[PDB]
RNA sequence: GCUAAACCUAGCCCCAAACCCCCACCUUACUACCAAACCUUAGCCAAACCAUUUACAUAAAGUAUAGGCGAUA
């Protein structure tokens, strides 16, 4: 879990257990193409390779082979009108190579105004014969 | 947005046995006679067109519908319009009666009228100032079937009527133009 | 496997999904404990799915299909914590009395402010630690002057707001 | 922007009330309130107080015109009696039917207050969201789940020095 | 440019308000009240000049010695500085001496 | 052309003007107290 | 506009309770 | 010079960059020669249920009856749990009903809090 | 004709009255986890320099009194 103080360990203690986990994981289509065994995750910055391996293996039952993590530095050059630097959050990206020769690719998700259309198609735009007169007067 | 109008026309009568529509319409108000429509139709038409000369902006808003105000006003904006009705020969009359759910009526008119529209510098561009010319017109009035005013919705042009008057101005119509490579072939 | 990170395929790109009702604190209080755990992990799966969906939608620049679902589950998640934490509270007292699970005390930092020091866990007793005793927990006398100033500053702020408040009301009563 | 202090108890108008105006444009006409905006006191009324506005206006292109409903202030507009046909002041008078209900001043009339779905593939049945499966337990969540699922542990937690 | 172009909204002064319709009531509580009171003790305001007048220096001395132990630190330092300056000025500066 | 008076270095930052150099002597706590009086956002590097 | 009730001396002896620290020293001895 | 900006792992000389981790927790210690020893007892090994046969789902039906918040105040829990028990047994010492005079024994202590989350 | 003009609440000043306010942080602060505090106020400024000297409710009274018996206190 995150934002919690952990029980400390002394030699011979019990196993530290998190019976109601706090972590929240999302996953993203890689920006530059990745091996067919790699899945790319965003995980909270208070999380570790061992945590993520156990996290996936325990919750989802997806056998993981290896994990490598990288902490991305959000940009801090984008100034508000007060001229205050505004920094979007740093994040942690985890590359997870699956085991047993499996393969994966992020599937392609995502595969009152009738009045304006109807009045525009029947707008009766300027008939250049008319030369600018109001047409409508049947007189 | 509670439009006061009815988008399009359900069945626009074709220019040259509807009591169910009467039952479904007059019920919602319960005080009306179709034979009371001719006088009101001519009165609203003439007073509204006089107001078009006046340029009383609010009165035109109250009389005409949303689909009818802006197109008239924009052209009439920044150019005087000296419209005038004169003595009529033929009484107008209902053409039919048509029924979220807002109703429609149509009226046939054969009038004697005059137009004179001047440029924003005062120069004539259309119509003759005082010639009383006969006209035939088909006009649809929409009825907002609470307190729905019986406004003039639109006028419809019949394809079997003579064309429009000439125009005192000379006009070009640039059609097939040249291209930097595509020739006039 | 990983397919649980995306909802059933029929909902892909639908632009609208029937969203149920977020759980309610009492409606969870009616439930047991094991079922509470299981429902928590169910909601975890849902929250992962929805956060992934949001990130992808933001990446495409196509609109988020139905964002409210995310908010709903988050609220449910929050509610769930409260319920179990309530039982936690409703046990601490009823077997130790303590109103806070994590032990702490009141102290005076080096600047004089009264601060609530929550304790950390250590495995040597405090009196022979070398980094703990470098951390002052007392106020030398030269601090006192600044305390007064700080209090005075705060007083001014309070006054202004209170004063300004009634002026608004007064002006309002001069309209009606 | 001056809006007089009127609290919820002192306020009477709501979304969907039969409202007749006292002043302003379209005087003395009745309508309904789609929305009441308490923060700035806007009263939208169907087709009443309308002001016609151009939509689609460029430097040349004129577009269409629509009667946008200009909202109204609460003093400008009062409620409508469904029987007496007269806007009467809403003096909060306690009644046996309801302690807080709109009661007319001219006559002892109480005005009522104006204010579906199916289970999906991922929604619970109602009768299964109320089962009283909870037995009152003094054991915390951790003990109960460990005993339930058979997780085993006997190594003891060693003493620690909090401070 | 130093002039406006729109007349301000005409202020409404209610010359027959409460606090204008009584300005001076009980301003003679002594000469016809058995001299129980004194108009001095009708005038609200600061504790250090309820019924007293002096120049700026005397006024600040009175403020010090009468409320100068309840006043915030920075204000008190400003006040002592003001006494020092007004002393220097009144006692060493001017045309007449 | 002149102006090379300042070659930055973080060790010297945090070991000449840090939070644990102000709190090492009482005058430094005067400085940090002045700065959290004036309401600054950089109490000490 | 019935004017406000006229000011008066507080009708009775002033016995300031001796608890509050604001009661001035001179208003507590035997002289007063 | 960037006084305002948050101080993080990416700024200082090489020593700083090595030392200041982030919120990620430690799991073990550093033995001689810059070697790392990780303990199985500091890895927060998760627990999960078997979701088989689970009748509860992420969203509740809108049709469910509306409710009211009544937080589990301590006396309420004690009543619901014990009051029948004390009532029945008093007609014929408190550890026999559920009380725990101390907490050093059991693995899931309440105060101080040992079990995580 | 451009550029420009023009406004009036945002708030603030002086008073009264009342005594006031989950997690991480002394190591390189915001980093889960190891062998000591007390000591006069100073001199600018006036004395036309400067050396003794030189301010920090009401009335008694600027009186007794001090003072290169002087500026002043």
PDB file of C-alpha atoms in Angstrom, chain C residues 44-120:
ATOM      1  CA  UNK C  44      -9.788  -2.712  -7.776  1.00  0.00           C
ATOM      2  CA  UNK C  45     -10.100  -4.583 -11.065  1.00  0.00           C
ATOM      3  CA  UNK C  46     -12.732  -2.107 -12.225  1.00  0.00           C
ATOM      4  CA  UNK C  47     -10.635   0.902 -11.247  1.00  0.00           C
ATOM      5  CA  UNK C  48      -7.613  -0.448 -13.114  1.00  0.00           C
ATOM      6  CA  UNK C  49      -9.744  -0.982 -16.217  1.00  0.00           C
ATOM      7  CA  UNK C  50     -11.181   2.518 -16.086  1.00  0.00           C
ATOM      8  CA  UNK C  51      -7.871   4.286 -15.446  1.00  0.00           C
ATOM      9  CA  UNK C  52      -6.294   2.445 -18.380  1.00  0.00           C
ATOM     10  CA  UNK C  53      -9.269   3.405 -20.538  1.00  0.00           C
ATOM     11  CA  UNK C  54      -8.926   7.063 -19.540  1.00  0.00           C
ATOM     12  CA  UNK C  55      -5.227   7.139 -20.348  1.00  0.00           C
ATOM     13  CA  UNK C  56      -5.773   5.563 -23.766  1.00  0.00           C
ATOM     14  CA  UNK C  57      -8.659   7.888 -24.626  1.00  0.00           C
ATOM     15  CA  UNK C  58      -6.557  10.887 -23.633  1.00  0.00           C
ATOM     16  CA  UNK C  59      -3.800   9.520 -25.863  1.00  0.00           C
ATOM     17  CA  UNK C  60      -6.038   9.229 -28.927  1.00  0.00           C
ATOM     18  CA  UNK C  61      -7.706  12.632 -28.274  1.00  0.00           C
ATOM     19  CA  UNK C  62     -11.017  10.843 -28.796  1.00  0.00           C
ATOM     20  CA  UNK C  63     -13.386  11.637 -25.927  1.00  0.00           C
ATOM     21  CA  UNK C  64     -13.559   9.649 -22.731  1.00  0.00           C
ATOM     22  CA  UNK C  65     -16.638   7.426 -23.273  1.00  0.00           C
ATOM     23  CA  UNK C  66     -18.331   7.794 -19.881  1.00  0.00           C
ATOM     24  CA  UNK C  67     -15.970   9.279 -17.273  1.00  0.00           C
ATOM     25  CA  UNK C  68     -18.489   9.333 -14.420  1.00  0.00           C
ATOM     26  CA  UNK C  69     -18.011   5.588 -13.884  1.00  0.00           C
ATOM     27  CA  UNK C  70     -14.461   6.221 -12.685  1.00  0.00           C
ATOM     28  CA  UNK C  71     -15.637   8.850 -10.218  1.00  0.00           C
ATOM     29  CA  UNK C  72     -18.379   6.530  -9.005  1.00  0.00           C
ATOM     30  CA  UNK C  73     -16.049   3.654  -8.247  1.00  0.00           C
ATOM     31  CA  UNK C  74     -13.552   5.981  -6.583  1.00  0.00           C
ATOM     32  CA  UNK C  75     -16.289   7.174  -4.253  1.00  0.00           C
ATOM     33  CA  UNK C  76     -17.269   3.565  -3.589  1.00  0.00           C
ATOM     34  CA  UNK C  77     -13.633   2.743  -2.899  1.00  0.00           C
ATOM     35  CA  UNK C  78     -13.389   5.631  -0.449  1.00  0.00           C
ATOM     36  CA  UNK C  79     -16.617   4.549   1.221  1.00  0.00           C
ATOM     37  CA  UNK C  80     -15.295   1.023   1.607  1.00  0.00           C
ATOM     38  CA  UNK C  81     -12.227   2.218   3.493  1.00  0.00           C
ATOM     39  CA  UNK C  82     -14.370   4.190   5.919  1.00  0.00           C
ATOM     40  CA  UNK C  83     -16.531   1.174   6.703  1.00  0.00           C
ATOM     41  CA  UNK C  84     -13.671  -1.124   7.579  1.00  0.00           C
ATOM     42  CA  UNK C  85     -11.806   1.687   9.306  1.00  0.00           C
ATOM     43  CA  UNK C  86     -14.930   2.361  11.348  1.00  0.00           C
ATOM     44  CA  UNK C  87     -14.813  -1.203  12.623  1.00  0.00           C
ATOM     45  CA  UNK C  88     -11.119  -0.687  13.291  1.00  0.00           C
ATOM     46  CA  UNK C  89     -11.981   2.365  15.362  1.00  0.00           C
ATOM     47  CA  UNK C  90     -14.913   0.566  16.941  1.00  0.00           C
ATOM     48  CA  UNK C  91     -12.452  -2.082  18.132  1.00  0.00           C
ATOM     49  CA  UNK C  92      -9.474   0.044  19.229  1.00  0.00           C
ATOM     50  CA  UNK C  93     -11.511   1.834  21.888  1.00  0.00           C
ATOM     51  CA  UNK C  94     -13.390  -1.298  22.895  1.00  0.00           C
ATOM     52  CA  UNK C  95     -10.105  -3.039  23.678  1.00  0.00           C
ATOM     53  CA  UNK C  96      -7.566  -0.264  24.302  1.00  0.00           C
ATOM     54  CA  UNK C  97      -9.390   3.082  24.527  1.00  0.00           C
ATOM     55  CA  UNK C  98      -6.873   4.878  22.329  1.00  0.00           C
ATOM     56  CA  UNK C  99      -8.521   7.255  19.867  1.00  0.00           C
ATOM     57  CA  UNK C 100      -5.618   7.110  17.371  1.00  0.00           C
ATOM     58  CA  UNK C 101      -4.018   3.874  16.184  1.00  0.00           C
ATOM     59  CA  UNK C 102      -0.604   5.390  15.465  1.00  0.00           C
ATOM     60  CA  UNK C 103       0.961   6.658  18.714  1.00  0.00           C
ATOM     61  CA  UNK C 104       2.038  10.275  18.997  1.00  0.00           C
ATOM     62  CA  UNK C 105       2.408  13.238  21.322  1.00  0.00           C
ATOM     63  CA  UNK C 106       2.402  17.046  21.474  1.00  0.00           C
ATOM     64  CA  UNK C 107       5.719  18.883  21.349  1.00  0.00           C
ATOM     65  CA  UNK C 108       7.341  22.244  20.697  1.00  0.00           C
ATOM     66  CA  UNK C 109       9.487  22.349  17.577  1.00  0.00           C
ATOM     67  CA  UNK C 110      12.610  24.496  17.509  1.00  0.00           C
ATOM     68  CA  UNK C 111      10.493  27.440  16.324  1.00  0.00           C
ATOM     69  CA  UNK C 112       7.991  27.232  19.180  1.00  0.00           C
ATOM     70  CA  UNK C 113       4.976  25.972  17.264  1.00  0.00           C
ATOM     71  CA  UNK C 114       2.869  23.358  19.010  1.00  0.00           C
ATOM     72  CA  UNK C 115       3.134  20.376  16.659  1.00  0.00           C
ATOM     73  CA  UNK C 116       1.743  16.856  16.881  1.00  0.00           C
ATOM     74  CA  UNK C 117       4.698  14.508  16.533  1.00  0.00           C
ATOM     75  CA  UNK C 118       3.554  11.152  15.229  1.00  0.00           C
ATOM     76  CA  UNK C 119       6.026   8.494  16.272  1.00  0.00           C
ATOM     77  CA  UNK C 120       8.283   6.450  14.014  1.00  0.00           C
TER      78      UNK C 120
END
